[PDB]
């Protein structure tokens, strides 16, 4: 239920020449600034997650 | 700083002792996938933040 949502990623908004998908904050990791939460995103949540 | 507490000096000690390359003998040990010390530290590069 929490797969792909265990992050505090937030959208940068427009004006920064990147897609409006939410991105991990912080810095100095490699994960920082990467897309999150999306079914199109590496490491994000799958579309319509399977349910019991 | 030169005038440091004992607690800070002890932290300097552990960091200095940890700051070594991997022993060359443990490489040959069976089923071992440690080729290098991935927790290496240089004073210029990464600060220990204490």
């Amino acid at each position: 239920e929490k797969a792909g949502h265990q992050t505090s990623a937030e959208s940068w908004g427009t004006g920064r020449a990147v897609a409006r998908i939410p991105r991990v904050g912080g810095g100095g990791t490699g994960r920082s600034g990467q897309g999150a939460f999306g079914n199109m995103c590496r490491g994000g949540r799958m579309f319509a997650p399977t349910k019991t | 700083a030169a005038q440091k507490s004992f607690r800070i000096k002890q932290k300097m000690a552990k960091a200095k002792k940890q700051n070594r390359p991997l022993p060359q003998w443990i490489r040959l040990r069976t089923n071992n996938t440690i080729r290098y010390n991935a927790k290496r530290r240089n004073w210029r590069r990464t600060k220990m933040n204490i």
Binding site: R16, R23, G27, G28, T29, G30, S32, G33 | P21, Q24, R35, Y36, A38
Partner: peptide, 28 residues
């Protein structure tokens, strides 16, 4: 034997975010 694991330091993705003058474009 003095192996070389690549540093792979990360760079802040923010980059420069400044525009010309103050506006350069207010009421075209």
């Amino acid at each position: 034997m003095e192996i070389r694991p690549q540093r792979h330091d990360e760079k802040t993705l923010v980059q420069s975010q400044v525009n010309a003058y103050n506006a350069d474009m207010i009421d075209p």
